[PDB]
Each structure stands twice: as C-alpha cells, then as structure tokens.
Design a protein around this ligand. Sequence first.
Ligand SMILES: *[C@@H]1O[C@H](CO[C@@H]2O[C@@H](C)[C@@H](O)[C@@H](O)[C@@H]2O)[C@@H](O[C@@H]2O[C@H](CO)[C@@H](O[C@@H]3O[C@H](CO[C@H]4O[C@H](CO)[C@@H](O)[C@H](O)[C@@H]4O[C@@H]4O[C@H](CO)[C@@H](O)[C@H](O)[C@H]4NC(C)=O)[C@@H](O)[C@H](O[C@H]4O[C@H](CO)[C@@H](O)[C@H](O)[C@@H]4O[C@@H]4O[C@H](CO)[C@@H](O)[C@H](O)[C@H]4NC(C)=O)[C@@H]3O)[C@H](O)[C@H]2NC(C)=O)[C@H](O)[C@H]1NC(C)=O
Ligand SMILES: *[C@@H]1O[C@H](CO[C@@H]2O[C@@H](C)[C@@H](O)[C@@H](O)[C@@H]2O)[C@@H](O[C@@H]2O[C@H](CO)[C@@H](O[C@@H]3O[C@H](CO[C@H]4O[C@H](CO)[C@@H](O)[C@H](O)[C@@H]4O[C@@H]4O[C@H](CO)[C@@H](O)[C@H](O)[C@H]4NC(C)=O)[C@@H](O)[C@H](O[C@H]4O[C@H](CO)[C@@H](O)[C@H](O)[C@@H]4O)[C@@H]3O)[C@H](O)[C@H]2NC(C)=O)[C@H](O)[C@H]1NC(C)=O
Lengths: 208, 207, 204, 186
Amino acid sequence: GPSVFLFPPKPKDTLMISRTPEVTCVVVDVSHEDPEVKFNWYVDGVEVHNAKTKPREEQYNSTYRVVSVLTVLHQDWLNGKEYKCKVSNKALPAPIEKTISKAKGQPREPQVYTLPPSREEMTKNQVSLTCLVKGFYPSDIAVEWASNGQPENNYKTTPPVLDSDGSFFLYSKLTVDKSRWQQGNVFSCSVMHEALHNHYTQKSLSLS
Amino acid sequence: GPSVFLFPPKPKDTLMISRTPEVTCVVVDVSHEDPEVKFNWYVDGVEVHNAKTKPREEQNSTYRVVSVLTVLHQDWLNGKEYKCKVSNKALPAPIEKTISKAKGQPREPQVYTLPPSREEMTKNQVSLTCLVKGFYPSDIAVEWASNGQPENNYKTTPPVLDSDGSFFLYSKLTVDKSRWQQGNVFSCSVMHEALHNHYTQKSLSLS
Amino acid sequence: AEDLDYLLRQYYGSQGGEAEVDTINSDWNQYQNYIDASQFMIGFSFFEESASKGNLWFDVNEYDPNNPEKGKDIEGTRAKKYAEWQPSTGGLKAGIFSYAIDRDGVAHVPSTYKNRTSTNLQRHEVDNISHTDYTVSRKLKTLMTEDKRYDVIDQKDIPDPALREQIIQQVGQYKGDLERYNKTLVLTGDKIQNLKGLEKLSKL
Amino acid sequence: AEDLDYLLRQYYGSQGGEAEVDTINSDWNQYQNYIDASQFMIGFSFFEESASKGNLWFEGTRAKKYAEWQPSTGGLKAGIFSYAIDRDGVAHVPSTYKNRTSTQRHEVDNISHTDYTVSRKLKTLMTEDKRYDVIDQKDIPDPALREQIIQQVGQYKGDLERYNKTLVLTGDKIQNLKGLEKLSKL
Ligand SMILES: *[C@@H]1O[C@H](CO[C@@H]2O[C@@H](C)[C@@H](O)[C@@H](O)[C@@H]2O)[C@@H](O[C@@H]2O[C@H](CO)[C@@H](O[C@@H]3O[C@H](CO[C@H]4O[C@H](CO)[C@@H](O)[C@H](O)[C@@H]4O[C@@H]4O[C@H](CO)[C@@H](O)[C@H](O)[C@H]4NC(C)=O)[C@@H](O)[C@H](O[C@H]4O[C@H](CO)[C@@H](O)[C@H](O)[C@@H]4O[C@@H]4O[C@H](CO)[C@@H](O)[C@H](O)[C@H]4NC(C)=O)[C@@H]3O)[C@H](O)[C@H]2NC(C)=O)[C@H](O)[C@H]1NC(C)=O
Ligand SMILES: *[C@@H]1O[C@H](CO[C@@H]2O[C@@H](C)[C@@H](O)[C@@H](O)[C@@H]2O)[C@@H](O[C@@H]2O[C@H](CO)[C@@H](O[C@@H]3O[C@H](CO[C@H]4O[C@H](CO)[C@@H](O)[C@H](O)[C@@H]4O[C@@H]4O[C@H](CO)[C@@H](O)[C@H](O)[C@H]4NC(C)=O)[C@@H](O)[C@H](O[C@H]4O[C@H](CO)[C@@H](O)[C@H](O)[C@@H]4O)[C@@H]3O)[C@H](O)[C@H]2NC(C)=O)[C@H](O)[C@H]1NC(C)=O
C-alpha cells in the first residue's frame, strides 16, 4: 500500500528573506490501477489550499510517486506551527496523516570562529580553511563560504554534533589553492541560524 | 515481528593489538510468547561456532537478545563478510544481515592540529582542534592526550565524505584557557589502517 | 518504420480510461503517420511464475478455487479486449500477441498478492509449472478470424470489379478497413464504369 | 488396528494426575504404535437418568478438556465423542449423591428435550482450534517437499511438532529442505 513521507524546509530557506521555504509531502508506491491521490494541508489544524501538487513519476513498472509542495511563511515555521499533510487514495483503508513542526527548545546563539591552515598543510597544493560554529541550539543551521563577494563552492560541512553542554557544534572546511591563500585574499564564513541577529553572521579569514 | 541490527567492531579494536574486536548482533522486539532466538554466524559464508549469546533483557513484555562474535583483526581488515542469521517462531523466514569493511584502496590520513581562534581567547574555555583528512576507509579513531595523561573533554565529528572520494573529520578538545596559555603540550592521536602501526600523533602547544 | 513488416506494441496491464485503452488509441493516433494499421500488433502478457510487483499485469483471469480451468477462459480478459480492439483510423490492426505463451492457460495470482516482492515472497499454486494446451491462444486466434470486420470486400460492397480492385490495393482487403481508412485514394483508368461503394469510405 | 477407521476410547470420569489425563497419555503411548493419531478419538459421558455409583462420571468441563487435549506424539487427534448425546445439556447430579446406589432422586433425573447445545459448542471449539490449520507455504515453502510431508505426517500444522516416525523424501523435484526442521520429533 502507499506510504507517506513529510520533509521540513531547508533551514536556510526558513531563515533567509531571499528564499521561500517549503514543506514537501511524498506518496510512494502508488498503483497504476487506482492513481488519484488527493492531498489536504493543515496549519495548526486550519486547512490551506495554496499547495502545489506535481504530477506522478513512474519509479518502476506500474508504480508511481506523487509529491505535493506547500509554501510556508517564515514566521509560521519559526513560531513552531504544526504542518499536517493528509493523503487520500482508493488503495488506502483510511487516509494517512503526517505532521511536522520546528524543533522545540531554548535557542542558543552560535559562536563562529575561523581557523587558518596548519603550517604543515602549507607544503601542499591545496590548503584547508576551517570554520568552527559552536554552542548553538537547535541544530538547524546553514554554513556557506565566500570571497570577494563571490560564493566559494568547494567546501564540506560536518553534520551538527552534540557537545557536552547540550548545545551543538560543527566544522566547515573550505579547500582553496595555496596560491590564493598566500596572496592574501579574504575568505568569509557565513552562518545562518535562528538565534543570530537577522539569522546571519559572517567571519573573515585571511593570511596574517 | 523481531528486527535485527548488526554493528561492526569499534575501529580502535580492529587496529590495536591490545584490543579484541567484536561484531555484535542485536535482536529487538522479541515476544514473551515465542522467545527462543537462534543465531547463526558466517564468515565469507562459512559457519563459525565461537559466538557468545548473552541472555534476554526486558527493554512492555518485550525482550532483546544480543550475540557477540569475536573477530580476528586480519579477517576484518582483509574485508571479510560477517553474516548474522536470526531465527524465531514469530518470523516467517530467518533474517540475514551482513557487514564488512568498505572495500577500496586505503588512503593515509593527514593530521593537522589547529590552535584556538584569536577571537575565542576572550573566553574561559578554548577549542583545540584536530583535522584529519584524506583517509579511506572511514573507519578511524581519535583521542587526545597531554603530558602522557588522557584528555577526555572532547568530541569528534563523524567522518564526512570529501569531494575527492576520501573522508575527513574534526575533533575538538576543550580546555581551560589557563592551561593553553601556560604552554602545555596537547596531542591528537589518530588510529587508522593506512598509518604505520595504525597510529600517529600530532602535537599542539602555544605559539 | 518504412522498413518494418510489423510493429509489436506491448500493452500489458491497464492503459487508462474507462475501457483501459486510452494509451493505445492515443499512441495509434501517432503510429498511423509512420505505419499502416495492417502492420500494427498489440500484446498482452500471461502470468509468469514467481512474478513480483512490477510484472503483475492481470491480462488473464485470476485463480478461482472452484474452477481450475478459469485461466483458460478468455471471457472478460484484457486478452479478449485486445483481440476485439481496432484502431479508429487507418484500418483494422494486424493482430495481437502474447508474452510467455508457454504459460497459456495458467490463472493469474489473486489480487491479494498484488504487492508481493522478491524478498517478501508469498508463493501460490499458480506459481507452479504446468504443461499447456495453448487453449487461450487458439480461442483468441479463432475469435479474430471469426470477426466479421475481417470479412473481405465483395461485390455487395463495391460492385464494379475494376474499382473494387483499386480500393483493395490502397485501403485494405477487409470490410472494416473502409470505415477507418483516412488517407488518399487515387482512382485511375478506363475500366471503371461506376463509382458505387465509394460512399463506404466514410473517413477518406 | 490396521483395518479400523477409528478407535473410540471411552475416558469417562477422571483419568488420574493433576490434569486428570494420565491414563489417556499413557494409553496413547501404546496406541500410537498401532494407529495414527488421526484415527484416535476420546469420549466423555453426559449424565444418564437414575444413574447409580458405577455410572457417575461428571467451562471447567472434562468435555472441554477432551476437545482441547491432543497427543504429545504422532499428531493431532481425530476428535471427541459423547455418550448419551440425548442427554446433552442436562446437568449432573451433585457430588453429594456420589454413592446413591440402587438401594435417592433429583430434578435432573427427569427427561427433557435437548437442543444439543453442548455438542455444538464442543464442535465449534475444535474447528476454531488453530492447530488444525493446514500446512501452507509459510511452513514448508517448497511445493514438492510440502506434498510429501503432508502425505506422510498429516495435513495440519500441529502434526509437524508431534510426528515421531519415518519420513522418506524422494525425487528430483525437491530444491530445498526448508520447513523440515519443524518435524522436531522425527
Ligand atoms: C517492465 O514491463 C515490461 C512490459 O510492460 C511494458 O512496459 C510497461 C512500462 C507498460 O507500458 C506495459 O503496458 C508494457 O507492456 C517488460 O517488457 C517485457 O516484459 C516482460 C515481463 O513483463 C519481460 O520478460 C522478462 O524478461 C526477462 C529477461 O528479459 C530480457 O530482455 C529484456 C529486454 O529485451 C532485458 O531488459 C533483460 O535484461 C533480458 O535481456 C537479456 O539479457 C541476457 C543477459 O542477461 C541476454 O543473454 C539475452 O539475450 C537478453 N535478451 C533480450 C535482450 O531479449 C526474464 O528474465 C523475466 O523472467 C524472469 O522472471 C519471471 C518472473 O517475473 C520468471 O517467471 C521467469 O522464469 C524469469 O525468472 C528466472 O528464471 C531463471 C531460469 O529459471 C532463473 O535463473 C532466475 O533466477 C529467475 N529470476 C527471477 C528473478 O525470477 C521475464 O520473462 C521482457 O523482457 C520484456 N520485453 C519483451 C520484448 O517482452 C519489462 O521487462 C519489465 N521490466 C522489468 C524490470 O521487469
Ligand atoms: C462401566 O463404565 C463404562 C464406561 O466407563 C469406561 O470404562 C470404565 C472401566 C473406566 O475405564 C472409565 O474411565 C471409562 O469411561 C460403561 O461403558 C459404557 O458406559 C455407558 C454408561 O456408563 C453404558 O451405558 C449403559 O448401557 C447399558 C446397556 O449396556 C449395553 O452395552 C453393553 C456393552 O456392549 C452390554 O454389556 C450390555 O449387555 C448392553 O448391550 C446389549 O444387550 C442387549 C440384550 O442382550 C442387546 O439387545 C443389545 O443389542 C446389546 N447392545 C450393545 C451395544 O451391546 C444400559 O442398560 C444403561 O442404561 C440404563 O441405566 C441408566 C443409568 O445407569 C439409565 O439412564 C438408562 O435409562 C437405563 O436404565 C446405560 O445406558 C454402555 O453400555 C457402556 N458401553 C458403551 C460402548 O458405551 C460400562 O457399561 C459400565 N459397566 C457397568 C456394568 O455399569
């Protein structure tokens, strides 16, 4: 029978004014025989009709997937309102109801520290610019890098890790050619979190 | 019905001669009514009889049953498959779960210790950082030390897949700023199959 | 397409709409520009043994516990539907085909097994292997050859032998082609006396 | 025994032990060498009118116990039977009349029409017993093996754990031997 999965918005989208956050609802293993899938969306038990259902997508022979995407208001999400997705189908005994809301708990402001390469790494053609973000709660966060106003894109960020004080921390690691580091270019580590002013801070990192 | 989880050995145990690595097999949600749980263990599809089943544990009216197979360091590191097979009356067919070490050219970790940020030095506790990058497979172990004694107030990130196919992580030891400024030496120990004797140490002191 | 003798379009399982042939008619609407209907052949599939979700089509009857021979009955089957089905345009189709004819007559696994899988396998009597008489194949062939649309064009349709000849060469040799042919007809020569029967080419 | 369809063993009254079925299990231990459990049937008796000591046998009924009872070995039993079914429903004379010899009386010694209420409850009980569920692919997957085991041990799930004789498996049709482990006493 059909299953339902309800995914929350990307944390950057909830926190940034330039972006529009979305709750997404996926129905998998839909039969070819009874294909009509009706979605109903609720925000604190209040029906909303502004959702946008994408058409079916054959996964394998005679089995489809159906996604519905509800745009959310930044404030509603951040105030921890419940988003309920209700799915109906002929091959269901009763409709399926899945709910998600934002992680509750006293927010704690992230502390952002940029760390330069190790002397030992400077023997290599590419060096590692590091950004430490610690002491934040909840674990919803987004980290990006930049340089001269342009996005730097060759980076990887660790998942949040629970620290011993109940808060979270992570590391992001931008990799750059040593040449660019030594020439004295400035790099920026952008952190986005609900407990920051305007959900945003930037720390810089250049050669001393 | 009953579920099965098969956990690999702790990477330090596979890599250190002082330690004995173990594959562990856990059966959860066993009913009071049909409680008999038989385990069968296989190493490259070859049955082994040296496993050790611990008795049931009420985790209501539902038990948990753990079976622990000791492994040989070489077998694990040569990437042999460990299969755990579970039988029960409340199972339609037996459950078979397998784990092995990730196959692939091993790559030696590069260990770099990073001192606190200038900005963190305004605080009563500061973060000593250890970056380990470019290692494969992702089985690794990181510890801290100072003056021969273990430092224990640290957390390490899970391995993260880098863009070049290797792994990296960060370990973050937290110390009182006083101890950092007084010029004590700290060590970041890394244990991995691609290191000589599966071991290196990088130092970190005030500069 | 210009070099093909036949296109064999596999249409196993339901193809949408009340009569479950939406995709067939929509597809034919395009196919007809490239081939003649006399080249077009639609297929159903028999029940294969140990088939899981992804290969369960229900083109033949399901197992019945009181009638072992239900798999050999073609009544109310997609197989019979395809035998009966014809294009709206162009002309009568070439025929039908079956997949896994070696399974001719075996009943389908019941609807209750519709979502069985390779891991989660729930086997059934009908997953066993059996000798076949090709009973369904012969019923479906006989059905089509006894269909009156495939009756040939006679003097009762087109009296003039000279006109009858040319229409046959251009539209087809069956009564049911006349209704459906929807392209060009070029009539030539001094042998044609009268044009009676030409009114039957309703879609020309 | 070889020519019998059924042996009907009358086990009216207590048969010894805490559960009052010692004599049944001990007897079955011998009976099983001569017949299949599918041929074995145990009986209780209803209360006959004007019965004296020597014919006083007496939920919490030996009737239900016999319906429920099964052999340890061989397989599930054939069923149960009653004596004097014409007395189905009529209650027993109390224990206090335990020795009321021919040289007493009670309301229950009078004759009455019966609806066979007890008989139908005992039949329904047995047909609702899950042990008599048939062997399916959930027990023995391989159809070829399932066939042969059914022919030899019985057609019920509860036969598998009990069958304690020989099983001869033959032919090139058998692919795997899964489910054969359920014949614990083979
Ligand atoms: C999806 O459905 C379509 C049909 O539907 C059509 O499309 C859909 C979307 C809708 O629009 C429909 O309306 C529309 O009609 C399938 O297409 C036909 O469908 C049937 C089944 O429905 C297929 O039959 C299967 O074929 C495989 C083998 O298939 C060969 O051909 C395929 C295409 O050409 C190709 O994809 C395959 O890889 C394979 O090709 C070959 O590769 C080998 C090397 O690997 C090479 O030597 C060959 O020369 C080459 N052949 C070619 C190119 O033709 C067959 O294996 C299937 O049967 C297995 O499963 C059955 C149960 O499901 C079981 O009864 C069978 O016995 C058999 O199973 C096994 O038996 C052996 C021997 O005993 C044993 O060793 C195995 O362990 C056992 N394995 C398993 C797991 O059961 C089956 O007959 C047709 O291929 C296909 N095309 C035509 C022209 O009919 C499409 O295949 C479907 N997709 C999937 C993934 O199922
Ligand atoms: C002792 O108990 C037995 C039951 O207990 C079993 O055995 C003991 C040892 C323990 O191990 C128990 O754990 C175990 O359960 C009795 O067996 C059956 O019991 C019932 C009742 O308890 C008997 O019913 C009674 O039958 C009387 C007639 O008996 C016929 O059958 C006998 C056996 O074949 C035979 O010996 C008799 O001669 C008689 O048979 C016929 O004879 C005539 C004339 O020659 C022929 O014309 C017929 O064709 C013959 N028919 C047959 C089938 O042979 C009834 O007289 C008696 O009824 C009377 O009394 C009751 C109250 O007591 C009244 O309600 C009733 O109205 C009537 O007046 C009763 O129905 C049954 O006979 C036993 N046999 C079977 C197969 O069921 C033993 O009988 C019992 N022994 C004694 C001596 O009491």
